[PDB]
Design a protein around this ligand. Structure first.
Ligand SMILES: CC(C)CCC[C@@H](C)[C@H]1CC[C@H]2[C@@H]3CC=C4C[C@@H](O)CC[C@]4(C)[C@H]3CC[C@]12C
Ligand SMILES: CC(C)CCC[C@@H](C)[C@H]1CC[C@H]2[C@@H]3CC=C4C[C@@H](O)CC[C@]4(C)[C@H]3CC[C@]12C
Ligand SMILES: CC(C)CCC[C@@H](C)[C@H]1CC[C@H]2[C@@H]3CC=C4C[C@@H](O)CC[C@]4(C)[C@H]3CC[C@]12C
Ligand SMILES: CC(C)CCC[C@@H](C)[C@H]1CC[C@H]2[C@@H]3CC=C4C[C@@H](O)CC[C@]4(C)[C@H]3CC[C@]12C
Ligand SMILES: [Cl-]
Ligand SMILES: [Cl-]
Ligand SMILES: [Cl-]
Ligand SMILES: [Cl-]
Lengths: 697, 697
């Protein structure tokens, strides 16, 4: 019957049923292939559909990432001036500087002086405000789903949740435009994490072109996992890192074939980015900073210390941001998203313009911090490198920036614009690591008499490398705020290329994960999932409460008896009334009202669809005709919509085993029986609600 | 009761029961921790036990790998002479060459001449024969399990199979000695793959030191997965590659925490190898060959061609080796393992000595082939690089070697000595890729007028890099013979460090996997698992036969009724007689012989152990006392050994869902019932046998 087997919005899919549908389609297609040669070519196309869709998703993700990077760089450069000779060229490419003219030279006509500084300040603020206004208005008017990182929603979707329109074309376009707008605005956010959502949108749009991936939910989830891998790859140019992230972060179920498919998609996207090098390649992709000297054993001490910082700040953020977000979801603050975005952008621009580090783009700041001092470098971060008073000043200039980055982010992650949390955390950790490395280098230079320095360092030698400390701090902050261990480390290593610095990174990361784990085992993405109330049966959480299945059945003593359907003692009108009277997703069809022996399970959606189709197709089905759910007045027959083998457990079964079954098999509901007689039903909603109750939420 | 919950040799574990035991122990330990501060310290130790065991396993694996490499290098160098000045020094380190003296100089007294060549030939053959004899005798006399790679057995074990003594200390020591002996003998084998078994042995030996990992099988399997990751890491110096290999090859179930634990163990082992650099670091670990020029798009054509070769040869090997192995398991050839090893070693030495490439160590040959021609290099492989006649001769010298390497391996993988298949396949692929690269370079140099070469190459330019072709060929052969895609590619990339050659590798690998997949979807390890007859329910295989649970129940119409135990209508003597009369692993305890309603499941081992313990502990239990399985003449009580919630499915349930339940939940048996009455039992053995029957085995 047409329509049978579909799902509604904000519903969970049944993986077993979807896979049964997929293999039934596979058997039918194989039979057709053996039937004819044209069907054989169709079967070959069906087999190659997965490769085709993953390749298309990778190519689209790479192209979109390149375009977004180019547009964001140009728009960010527009704030501080423009290149009259070539308006399309950005500041860096325009000066590759008489061609570049600042707003002071174009309005006041003076390149220097207090008036020039004032004009530049006002123009910077105005451009930031305009970009923020455009981004928020576009998000609110066209695609409200384009707001946020999207990683929490993608995680919920890959678990089996349905969010219609989240991965649509409208959301893709609006997010693509608004991410560039927000990045140019200068808000404390990034465009690396959100790229995963863009890749997922592309994956869905391409999956619509293949019947195998367009009529089955599980195959769509596999394509989405590959898309997420490709998105991370384009974000950080780390295809292996992207595959690991898909494996450990967003993919609830990851078949082995999906591993290689996601790896191929990530490699294709990385190759697409390489082809347009350096046009669409970001600074992070082109980082490629060489190392001066190898790390040393004693240096692991400050690194671990950095880890502690990464463990602490992230925890604080998880406690702060969430709380603020909750206030936005409870008070009137959420009724004025445009005003909130405008105010945040104004404050950020005003407080960031005076300080060169904050006025600097976050990605460029990260690149500079990771970049090591050189003989040709004369930046304030490397003016001293003996050392002078300016060092202290430099440290001061860093410290303030750090504080700024810590504050704005808390009020920036959650606003109604595309915002990413990877870049801000990386910048904060990089600043902290740079400060720590500067301190360690100064101590080594002024106290080389210590046996540790005298053994592992030499007078007038590059024993200490602050760039490595900044990298370690960035990795520690990312791990402490996301609780990622392997994917994070591999992504950092691929981004920086420091194969010899994998050990220094890992350690720090682990430390952060432990420290944060002391203040809470939940990460930022999971915390946001819980805040939004999405149905998520996280496997990381362990159910320790000693309860039995009898304690979770909905039809309790106080509750009314569960609605059931007789095999062949029901009519179409009665079934319609039952559907319109009960709120159950499905109903268990029993043999008889006395025996109450389970016969099957019929979903309400399929039941209604079958009834309507039969009424519109045949004559005499006006309610008088009976409905028979058994096998072979024109009585209605609805055996095709019922499940012959619903999962069942005993009333005394410990709830831990039930949760295990639900997690591993991805079931939708389980019929709790005893003596072969139906008693109750435990649904994923009930399991989640019980888990929340036992967790004191 | 002591002894309850144990397993016998060659038996499969029940993952659900083990995990229940583990969490019950966790709850008890948490209660004790809350009881006292000493118990709190004990709880901290229990929590840190996993980190401690993985760290110990990594350290032991690294140390053993270094020692094995050093010993193998020295023993191999001993065959062609000795360093009189420093007998402990090897040929390369002795000449770092008056100090080094060949056997001709030490016996005949003439360094050059036909007599010197004859003496060197005879001494080489004698040393190879002696090493082979020692290895085979040690394997056959002390640890028969030390033979082979061990990857198939490790894969079976990680799926829940029990092989007592496979990972013991005796096996570890014997394999460690015999791997070095066999490598020195010159047989067509390697010591990289077998290192995984060494790591697993270390992991088991260390897991014996922690009660959490000593009393639970699943935790031991997690430790073994970490050990396998560390073993691969030490084998190829690719901790990420080792983690991926553990994820995709040997680990049936891989918890998320086990991922980070395995990564940490691999990193620790790699760091241990680094600390002893270059003493215990193999040539593969110290490969680190720089790259001259980047690869080009047209070069992807021959690379794919190499993939085809890798796809073909491997398939052939899977068809040849297995067959020969089957002959060794059916004819009298298997009755003389020592003689077979001696004959194979004699033939290999005799046929390899004349040709310099075969006389050369396989690892050194791989390093040379991957190594690119340089101005200071004057080797025959790079004598020409215009080109002369010698090129052809060089190619000839390669071609013969290739054929040799293809033949001996077929007769070498399966003998009663520690043998690895990674190194031979890598060498074969490297030779093929070197030949292909030489041909392509010659064509480009003599036919640069072609638009392709004129566009992507220049006159007198290093457009073609034969080392990259050799690397691609090695990767293709490895993928074709093992059907590994992501782990293989990452391992190769980490080994070579060519982050810019990931795309050329991947493609080729994929091609091989496809080509081999056309001649059979099973790899060498799975083929050997099937040949040995181990019980393996591979998840990669898909069950498409449309059968129901009723078709797999053992108690069929022809078979006798299933043995059952009444709840409280049985005696100790009757239960003992039933145990000694039936071969079932466990028996279903029913409420009554008339109702036949399932009450629980009692394992034969636990039943016998409980009966014996009760008889030896209490008085009056002499068979007259009744046995009651219900809850509360001194009747025996055996409720603690009975499972209250055995998994059950309906008789009409499709067998596909049953296979899914068995694979995902790792069950041991499922009770098939109808109307709430027990009918039959489907065990993993029956599922495996039905799968074999449906596969026409
Ligand atoms: C909000 C974003 C999307 C707007 C993008 C278009 C921007 C870059 C456009 C809008 C108005 C434009 C300006 C309009 C007028 C002039 C005067 C001319 O003598 C030099 C160029 C200059 C100064 C233009 C530079 C580019 C400009 C700033
Ligand atoms: C090894 C050295 C460098 C570490 C130095 C920092 C130490 C003192 C830090 C690291 C982790 C920290 C712990 C992390 C979290 C908690 C839980 C909280 O409810 C009380 C404090 C407590 C228990 C912290 C105490 C201080 C602590 C132990
Ligand atoms: C089979 C393996 C394990 C044996 C290991 C020990 C080997 C290396 C031993 C056994 C016999 C030894 C030889 C015995 C006698 C002499 C004569 C002396 O003037 C030079 C050293 C020389 C030539 C020895 C070299 C080392 C030697 C070959
Ligand atoms: C793309 C170019 C370079 C590939 C050139 C090699 C081609 C001809 C190879 C690659 C894979 C090969 C196929 C692989 C396996 C099979 C199955 C076998 O039962 C019949 C031959 C057949 C069908 C092969 C035919 C030839 C084949 C198609
Ligand atoms: Cl970001
Ligand atoms: Cl993000
Ligand atoms: Cl090997
Ligand atoms: Cl092997």
């Amino acid at each position: 019957i047409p329509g049978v087997g579909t799902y509604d919005d904000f519903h969970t899919i049944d993986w077993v049923r979807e896979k049964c549908k997929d293999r039934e389609r596979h058997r039918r297609i194989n039979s057709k292939k053996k039937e004819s040669a044209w069907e054989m070519t169709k079967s070959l196309y069906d087999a190659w559909s997965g490769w085709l869709v993953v390749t298309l998703t990778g190519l689209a993700s790479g192209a979109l990432a390149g375009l977004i990077d180019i547009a964001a760089d140009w728009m960010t450069d527009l704030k501080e001036g423009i290149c009259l000779s070539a308006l399309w060229y950005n500041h860096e490419q325009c000066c590759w500087c008489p061609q570049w003219k600042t707003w002071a030279e174009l309005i006041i006509g003076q390149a220097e002086g207090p008036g020039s500084y004032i004009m530049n300040y006002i123009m910077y603020i105005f451009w930031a405000l305009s970009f923020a206004f455009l981004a928020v208005s576009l998000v609110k008017v066209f695609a409200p789903y384009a707001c946020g990182s999207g990683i929490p929603e993608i995680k919920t979707i890959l678990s089996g949740f349905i969010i219609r329109g989240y991965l649509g074309k409208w959301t893709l376009m609006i997010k693509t435009i608004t991410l560039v707008l927000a990045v140019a605005s200068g808000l404390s956010l990034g465009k690396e994490g959100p790229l995963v959502h863009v890749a997922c949108c592309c994956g869905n749009i391409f999956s619509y072109l293949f019947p195998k991936y367009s009529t089955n939910e599980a195959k769509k989830r596999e394509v989405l996992s590959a898309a997420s891998a490709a998105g991370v790859s384009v974000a950080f140019g780390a295809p292996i890192g992207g595959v690991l992230f898909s494996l450990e972060e967003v993919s609830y179920y990851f078949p082995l074939k999906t591993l290689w498919r996601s790896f191929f998609a990530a490699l294709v996207a990385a190759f697409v980015l390489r082809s347009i090098n350096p046009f669409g390649n970001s600074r992070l992709v082109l980082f490629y900073v060489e190392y001066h000297t190898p790390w040393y054993l004693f240096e692991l001490f400050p690194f671990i210390l950095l880890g502690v910082f990464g463990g602490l700040w992230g925890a604080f953020f998880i406690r702060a941001n969430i709380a603020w977000c909750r206030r936005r979801k409870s008070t009137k603050f959420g009724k004025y998203p445009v005003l909130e975005v405008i105010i945040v952008a104004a404050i950020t621009a005003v407080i960031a313009f005076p300080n060169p580090y904050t006025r600097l783009n976050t990605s460029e700041l990260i690149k500079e911090l990771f970049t090591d001092c050189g003989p040709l470098e004369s930046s304030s971060l490397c003016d001293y490198r003996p050392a002078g008073i300016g060092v202290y000043s430099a440290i001061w200039q860093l410290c303030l920036a750090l504080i700024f980055k810590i504050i704005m982010t808390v009020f920036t992650f959650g606003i109604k614009v595309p915002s990413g949390l990877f870049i801000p955390s990386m910048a904060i950790g990089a600043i902290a690591g740079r400060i720590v490395g500067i301190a360690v280098e100064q101590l080594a230079y002024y106290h080389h008499d210590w046996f540790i320095f005298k053994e592992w360092c030499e007078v007038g030698a590059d024993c200490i490398t602050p760039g490595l400390y900044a990298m370690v701090g960035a990795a520690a902050c990312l791990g402490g705020v996301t609780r990622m261990t392997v994917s994070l480390v591999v992504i950092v290593f691929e981004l920086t290329g420091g194969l010899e610095y994998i050990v220094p990174l890992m350690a720090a990361v682990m430390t952060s994960k432990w420290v944060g784990d002391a203040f809470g085992r939940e990460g930022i993405y999971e915390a946001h999932i819980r805040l939004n109330g999405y149905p998520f049966l996280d496997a990381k959480e362990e159910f320790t409460h000693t309860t039995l299945a009898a304690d979770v059945m909905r039809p309790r003593r106080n509750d009314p008896p569960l609605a059931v359907l007789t095999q062949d003692n029901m009519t179409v009108d009665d079934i319609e009334n039952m559907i319109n009277e009960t709120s159950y997703n499905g109903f268990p069809v029993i043999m008889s009202k006395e025996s109450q022996r389970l016969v099957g399970f019929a979903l309400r959606r399929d039941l209604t669809i079958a009834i309507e189709s039969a009424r519109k197709k045949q004559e005499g089905i006006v309610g008088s005709s009976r409905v028979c759910f058994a096998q072979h007045p024109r009585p209605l027959k609805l055996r095709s919509i019922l499940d012959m083998s619903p999962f069942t457990v005993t009333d005394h079964t410990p709830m831990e085993i039930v949760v295990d079954i639900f997690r591993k098999l991805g079931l939708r509901q389980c019929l709790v029986t005893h003596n072969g007689r139906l008693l109750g039903i435990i649904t994923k909603k009930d399991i989640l609600r019980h888990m929340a109750q036992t967790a004191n939420q």
